[PDB]
Design an enzyme around this catalytic site. Structure first.
Site, mmCIF file in Angstrom:
data_model
loop_
_atom_site.group_PDB
_atom_site.id
_atom_site.type_symbol
_atom_site.label_atom_id
_atom_site.label_comp_id
_atom_site.label_asym_id
_atom_site.label_seq_id
_atom_site.Cartn_x
_atom_site.Cartn_y
_atom_site.Cartn_z
ATOM 1 N N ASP A 12 -36.500 23.316 -48.074
ATOM 2 C CA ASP A 12 -36.435 21.959 -48.603
ATOM 3 C C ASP A 12 -35.532 21.861 -49.826
ATOM 4 O O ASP A 12 -35.075 20.763 -50.159
ATOM 5 C CB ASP A 12 -37.839 21.465 -48.963
ATOM 6 C CG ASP A 12 -38.840 21.666 -47.841
ATOM 7 O OD1 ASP A 12 -38.451 21.547 -46.659
ATOM 8 O OD2 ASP A 12 -40.019 21.941 -48.143
ATOM 9 N N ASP B 184 -36.658 28.625 -49.847
ATOM 10 C CA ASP B 184 -37.284 27.305 -49.842
ATOM 11 C C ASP B 184 -36.294 26.364 -49.164
ATOM 12 O O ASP B 184 -35.339 25.895 -49.788
ATOM 13 C CB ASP B 184 -37.625 26.852 -51.257
ATOM 14 C CG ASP B 184 -38.550 25.647 -51.280
ATOM 15 O OD1 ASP B 184 -38.364 24.729 -50.454
ATOM 16 O OD2 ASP B 184 -39.468 25.619 -52.124
#
Lengths: 370, 410, 412, 368
Positions: free
Chosen positions: A113, A111
């Site tokens: 982000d 992920d």
């Protein structure tokens, strides 16, 4: 906040009973047999009864070997006034999931982000880039992000250029660059890497049949309902913000920047969902507050698309993220999910993943260099 | 005096919110009992606004509710020991000024329109803003001393707009800096941390006598410094201000460090920590070694604080101290920032309604620094809030200026 | 003894102690099952401390297996707290735990309760507050390998109106053959006959069974909580024990006693006028009460108004700086402020008989009083019984101190 | 009203700790009453429904502000400096608002006998009020005790109430409005000219009830019987399993001269029964009830019986009022009719006396 809080109180009771530093094997192995029971019959299991929101165990979690491994190094049972904490149980569950990967891994997903650029700006970590480099030689590496750039590969490469810089030096000769993937728009735009360490768009024709279908008109009215509500949020709170619309995403951006209250952003998120509910829309979407964007699609189904596309078994997949930043359909329902909270933990798990089948290497999830 | 302030120098968060290695960025997602013990007055108002919100009346006329709260605040200012507010909240603090909580709410609600929300009730962070507003609106006769917690709100120093506001306020009041860093009486090391602030003092604060109003309290309450015309820090001799401080025998100071040293040496053994102990004149610390720095678990550092506090109780010591963590290291100081504030207002002969302290209560315990006992306090969580509060302080008496505690330019 | 005569417990919006609304045994356990965690934890912190331990063992699915390592570790803390009640680890985890006058065999008490009732075989109901109240009652009974010299009852909570249970009059009678003490908030000066009327069927049983062997002398009655002492004579008749005989075991309070009554009366007169109560004030030599008037039955005072009045009086006591021990209670339908303390009345009985605290046991219902008035396990060992069925079970186990102790069911 | 009572309890608590509850709080109260009126008009899309999911439906417009003033003027709970409003006083105020919303009267008054009528029936002043109310409305009694079609067994419990009807409610024909529904929602009975119960043929009223076939009713009892059989052997109970046609029960045996089952075991067995039925994909409304000493799972529910009497007697939902005790069954009748929550006989007679004066009499729900 379900399975972690489950063991936390169990350890708290063993702590205040003054027996947590003694032989707690009877308690641990009863919990482990619970986890093994749940892995075999995940419906109407005993663990399902106590924790209804518990996911599916794609592996047999050695929670007893995970506690002994963590306690031998960090001696959490030798503390007289500080019981085990939320983060230590989280490290222990991360330790159990890595120990359960006896068969190895063929796909490791990030992920971005939350793991690669939580700052909000382009990748920047050479040691972290080196771990992803050596792991790419042994398995597929996929990166999931919420960035909305449509299908121009130059914008996504701008964020991962420091990572693709490392691919240029070591990941071209042996052909490992072919196994690197990027899923943009959470679950709508796919990209790959060529010999020149450059991202290129994978046409929909090559992977569209692996994604569940959502109507174009259904996608639009989701953005239409989201658009009118944000317009009212601007007028209600007198915001100096603007609405930016895309093909499958719409956002509330502040004018250059202006600061929008975190509470007003959360208020806008609750008006959107509540409005989509009132119009009886059943399609999955992701209204997200970043400290607002409404993407049609979530990162979990994006992990599903990548598992089908590469034809990987659930056991041989592992996802790495930070569940503090989102509080969402859990990605643990589609893959084994490690929970890392700072870069030093991420580099600890990636180092132990490089030494999965090696018995001399002790799994570590907290300190890369200790 | 520090005897009147309820210090709990020797007196569990399973989520470890104060762990900044894991709580890395703007915290907003995550905490009830933790936020309540940090300030029970905020959570007291959070629950009242929540009921007004859920009763669907928070955006109508709630002056009846706010004015009875304000009257309770006024009464608590007049008799802080037998007031109704002292009964509902036991650890309130002292209101050194009358707090206009009604106008502070109208001011925050008119700009941010928090009562127009349908699904998010007023949060803990917004009431803290409204409290800071009330504290500033109460300063109708001005300020004579403004103290900063450097470790929580200033840090080295690198903020040119922040330095400019301090320089502007330095021309109107005494500016004091309280830090936990201990470098004995050598003002060189303290000068290196405040260098960009002192270099700004050289340019705008030398011609006028403003530089004479700047004070630095090192070692929490042990090493005082002033500024000369060359914008250079120099030690104020201990004999000059020692009688403003509760006397702690030199034999007691060393024994406190001797108790802390043997606890920390046992913590090193119990957990195999790659750390050493560095001992100062009035402080001692557990410091991680440098890898050929190492890391000590946050829970091990919290365990070491409690052991040190518990062993000091066993040794029958009532001297004020501050054993605290700090993310990466452990530090036990024979000193107290709350007494450091008391020494400063006694030295400067300031009355209490003309003092204001700026600090971040998220980063310290209420046992070490109790809330609203030295002076009226502002709780800021980021520099933009600090800049907003200083500019609001800079524009007191200026009716054209609407006080703002959250956004600088907005 | 950490008395809090003027302190108050946290507020209860559920009004569990309201007997008018909570009048069924079925009502109480349902609300106990849910709206009750804060009050039960305040009634006894050691019970709720153990409830959460078993709840974690149950939820970990090990409570059916060998949990001796958890139980023996808990037992070691009980032994160390018996040996060092000031700075035990148990004192650090539970501040208001109290004093263990005996070495509690809590492991053997859990086995005894589990093998008979099989609470561990349950899959969906973990051990409750009342069952860990029973295991502890058993632990205290099993701890009396050296027996009992004195047995005390709170008559207001365990015996009664007037005494009416011959089977219960059978147990105390053969137990009287150890010292038996009766503690009562009822105040009738030194009127021995008015205390007789409420113990009439108990004393009449003593006449047929306790005169020949002379056991009648070991029966005592403490009236006015700690003000009026009584003994029993050859004719099963109560007679006054002169206060001069025992007053030096009691904390001397200045005839200060009258000022507490004047403070409470003036506060209760404001309470009457504030809420328009159809009640009057009755004043005794050492107590004063707010009693409702007769219906031209008697009028009803709100439980919450009786609660408000109690808090007011004790706050008025603090502002007058009176630190003398007293007890102001709610009483359901009428208020009473007594210059006396049952916990102090127990210490007098222990001093009067010169009996070790290891040989003393108290039977009472902590649901019906506050811990600030009768602190937990500070005068003697204490048995928490909820109905006459639990009292007869505990008394029968003390009788046969072949026998497996039972604290829940008399027959079963 | 557990969710709605605590809703006001928490709101009156904040007014207490803000020092304003003895002052003028008309803005807060009428902001709540406006939410109640909006819920009466659009219950599915109301602000109140978002705050309280299980609030249900309001069949009347609640004058909660007038209910607060009425209760506070006599009992003066706002003059208390240290005892804020309790769960019971809000419950009393919620009973006041419902009685106050009955401007046009009632056509049906329902009693849960197990909760409000059995201290057998033995209360003359309560029997006097029910007799007076029977002269102006239909009086229904709903009982979980199932003695099948046998009216002589039901009459034993209501004997002193029926014998009071014999001396007052026979000449005017008021007995024709008295109804008894045994088996929760399975056995209906009426009263004749001799103040005696007679069963009503199910064929004459079965069409007012959702149909459950002999195939489904029996499977509820078959699963329960085997779960109860495991429970008796698991904890070594001296109890039997009494099976009827529409209910089956765990009953303790008598002593040689009854035995007692742990309340936790009875709760352990209800949970085992309910979870086993869900395993068998049965969605029919049954009622597994603890009741202190004996377990009973009955096919049917007291709420269904209230709907049956509504459709039978042609009673509008605004003209219905049920009287029960929700401390005893918190494991709801509020979805079928107006429901009063009463906790002691004095509250029952107080509320009933207020219902006799619905058309100068200040309503009372606490002391008669």
């Amino acid at each position: 906040d379900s399975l972690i809080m489950f063991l936390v109180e169990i350890f708290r009771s063993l702590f205040v009973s003054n027996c947590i530093d003694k032989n707690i094997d009877n308690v641990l192995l009863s919990i482990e047999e619970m986890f093994i029971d749940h892995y075999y019959n995940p419906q109407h299991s005993r663990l399902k009864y106590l924790i209804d929101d518990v996911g599916i165990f794609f592996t047999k979690l050695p929670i007893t070997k995970a506690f002994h491994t963590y306690n031998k190094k960090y001696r959490i049972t030798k503390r007289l006034y500080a019981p085990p904490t939320f983060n230590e149980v989280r490290h222990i569950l991360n330790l159990a999931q890595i120990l359960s990967l006896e068969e190895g891994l063929d796909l490791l997903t990030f992920d971005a982000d939350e793991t690669l650029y939580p700052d909000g700006h382009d990748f920047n970590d050479e040691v972290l880039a080196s771990y992803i480099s050596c792991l790419l030689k042994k398995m597929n590496i996929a990166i999931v992000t919420a960035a909305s750039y449509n299908n121009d590969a130059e914008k996504y490469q701008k964020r991962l250029e420091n990572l693709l810089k490392y691919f240029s030096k070591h990941n071209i000769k042996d052909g490992s660059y072919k196994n690197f993937y990027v899923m943009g728009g959470e679950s709508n735009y796919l990209f790959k890497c060529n010999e020149e360490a450059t991202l290129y768009s994978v046409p929909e024709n090559e992977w569209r049949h692996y994604k569940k279908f959502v109507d174009y008109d259904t996608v639009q009215e989701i953005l239409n309902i989201s658009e009118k509500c944000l317009e009212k949020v601007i007028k209600d709170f007198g915001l100096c913000a603007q609405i930016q619309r895309k093909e499958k995403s719409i956002g509330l951006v502040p004018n250059k920047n202006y600061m929008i209250k975190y509470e007003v952003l959360e208020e806008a998120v609750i008006r959107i969902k509540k409005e989509i509910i009132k119009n009886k829309i059943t399609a999955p979407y992701c209204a997200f507050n970043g400290g607002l964007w409404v993407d049609v699609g979530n990162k979990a189904e994006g992990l599903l698309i990548l598992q089908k596309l590469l034809k990987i078994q659930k056991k041989k997949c592992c996802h790495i993220g930070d569940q503090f930043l989102h509080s969402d359909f859990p990605t643990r329902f589609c893959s084994l999910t490690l929970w890392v909270s700072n870069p030093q933990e991420t580099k600890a798990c990636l180092k132990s993943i490089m030494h999965l089948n090696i018995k001399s290497f002790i799994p570590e999830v907290l300190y890369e260099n200790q």
